[PDB]
Amino acid sequence: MGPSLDFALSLLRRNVRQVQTDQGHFTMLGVRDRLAVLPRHSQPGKTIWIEHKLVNILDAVELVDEQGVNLELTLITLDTNEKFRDITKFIPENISTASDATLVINTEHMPSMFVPVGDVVQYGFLNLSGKPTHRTMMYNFPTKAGQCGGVVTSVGKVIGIHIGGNGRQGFCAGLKRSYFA
């Protein structure tokens, strides 16, 4: 088997988990140790359903930039035995664009799902349901409900988390390594 598909399947196996909050189904990225990331609008509570069991959340941190403005990402620290494989070295130091990327989704409704969103470009400001958001990127693919939390990847790099779309385009929150230091 080739190397792009090997890395994507390895993500699914070790780092990209099926979750449910009171807002419904999401894809969750485990970054290292007991630290994961979800979209802010998933509103993780005191507990979260992960794959086949209810896991306690020890801490949640919603990320905003210096402008006080929403970045649409919540860092969760989980109460588990599991250490996630550390994938911080695949996350660029600065939010990066990409050609021919793939969005990897993993939900109970959309399990191990691969979506070819194409090129991923700087976009910046986005308005999601009256919530202003910075540091977004855009792909010209008609993403859909149930795909938030999805992992934007390409060439062994992990560059975003899907948060939105308008029926013709999709949008992720950009990743940078400093968030997971």
Binding site residues, ligand 5EX, CB under 6 A: 24, 41, 72, 126-129, 131, 143-148, 163-166, 170
Taking the C-alpha atoms of residue 107 and residue 75, their distance in angstroms, rounded to an integer, is 19
Active site (annotated) includes residue 72: yes
Taking the C-alpha atoms of residue 44 and residue 89, their distance in angstroms, rounded to an integer, is 26
Residue at 119: amino acid letter: D
Length of the chain: 181
Cβ nearer to ligand 5EX, comparing 34 with 117:
117
CB 84, min distance to ligand 5EX, A? 23
CB 143, min distance to ligand 5EX, A? 3
CB 59, min distance to ligand 5EX, A? 21
CB 158, min distance to ligand 5EX, A? 19
Of the listed 52, 66, 93, 148, which one is catalytic?
A: 148
Cβ nearer to ligand 5EX, comparing 99 with 166:
166
Q: Which two tokens stand for residue 121?
A: 């470009």
Cβ nearer to ligand 5EX, comparing 55 with 173:
173
Question: H/E element holding 5?
Answer: helix 3-14
Taking the C-alpha atoms of residue 86 and residue 84, their distance in angstroms, rounded to an integer, is 6
Active site (annotated) includes residue 93: no
Cβ nearer to ligand 5EX, comparing 95 with 110:
110
Taking the C-alpha atoms of residue 51 and residue 48, their distance in angstroms, rounded to an integer, is 10
Burial of 59 (0-12, 13-18, 19+ CB in 10 A): exposed
Active site (annotated) includes residue 148: yes
The catalytic residue positions are 41, 72, 148
